[PDB]
Design an enzyme around this catalytic site. Structure first.
Site, mmCIF file in Angstrom:
data_model
loop_
_atom_site.group_PDB
_atom_site.id
_atom_site.type_symbol
_atom_site.label_atom_id
_atom_site.label_comp_id
_atom_site.label_asym_id
_atom_site.label_seq_id
_atom_site.Cartn_x
_atom_site.Cartn_y
_atom_site.Cartn_z
ATOM 1 N NE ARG A 1 55.647 32.352 29.124
ATOM 2 C CZ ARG A 1 56.031 32.564 30.375
ATOM 3 N NH1 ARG A 1 56.656 33.686 30.691
ATOM 4 N NH2 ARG A 1 55.797 31.636 31.305
ATOM 5 C CG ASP B 1 57.031 33.820 37.108
ATOM 6 O OD1 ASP B 1 56.157 34.344 37.799
ATOM 7 O OD2 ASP B 1 57.119 32.586 36.987
ATOM 8 C CB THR B 2 55.131 39.540 34.414
ATOM 9 O OG1 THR B 2 54.159 38.988 33.517
ATOM 10 C CG2 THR B 2 56.341 39.988 33.654
ATOM 11 N NE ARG C 1 48.415 32.942 24.634
ATOM 12 C CZ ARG C 1 47.231 32.908 23.984
ATOM 13 N NH1 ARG C 1 47.171 32.565 22.689
ATOM 14 N NH2 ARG C 1 46.118 33.177 24.635
ATOM 15 C CG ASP D 1 54.769 36.596 31.281
ATOM 16 O OD1 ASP D 1 54.193 35.736 30.637
ATOM 17 O OD2 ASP D 1 54.618 36.695 32.515
ATOM 18 C CD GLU E 1 47.077 36.333 38.763
ATOM 19 O OE1 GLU E 1 45.884 36.562 38.555
ATOM 20 O OE2 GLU E 1 47.485 35.211 39.125
#
Length: 149
Positions: free
Chosen positions: A35, A40-41, A87, A21, A43
């Site tokens: 961004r 919501d990606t 971002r 993201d 990690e």
């Protein structure tokens, strides 16, 4: 066209996909780490159960769209223009396709909420999330919630 979505498309060129993201794009002739709005990606988390490390998948899907796009556009929302570390928080189109949706539609993202203002397509992301949920996509293939998926 009268719409709640009175935003503005702007050009971006792929420089470097940072996360699922987060993406450095050239905007206005300058590199900026964008961004993905409403996204919501995950990690690179656990490689077993739960919210798995679907980071490379997400990042490479985002990367896919953005590297594949010859035209990336963005659309800054009415909330903010900058998130995380400042971002560039905006709607993002990759070859005209919405990255945000596509990430959450792929099951590489969940519907987030950035700032009171920028959520003009949150409905769509929650819908894409729920779509990915109902079909059980990547993150949604995991039992991380199972309360909607």
């Amino acid at each position: 066209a009268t719409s709640t979505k009175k935003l503005h498309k702007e050009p971006a060129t792929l420089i470097k996909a940072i996360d699922g993201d987060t993406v450095k794009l050239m905007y206005k002739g300058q590199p900026m780490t964008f961004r993905l709005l409403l996204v919501d990606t995950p990690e690179t988390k656990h490689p077993k159960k739960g919210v798995e490390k679907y980071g490379p998948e997400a990042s490479a899907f985002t990367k896919k769209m953005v590297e594949n796009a010859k035209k990336i556009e963005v659309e800054f929302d009415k909330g903010q223009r900058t998130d995380k570390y400042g971002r560039g928080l905006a709607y993002i189109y990759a070859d005209g396709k919405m990255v945000n949706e596509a990430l959450v539609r792929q099951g590489l993202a969940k519907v987030a909420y950035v700032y009171k203002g920028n959520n003009t397509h949150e409905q769509l992301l929650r819908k894409a999330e729920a779509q990915a949920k109902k079909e059980k996509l990547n993150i949604w293939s995991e039992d991380n919630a199972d309360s909607g998926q």
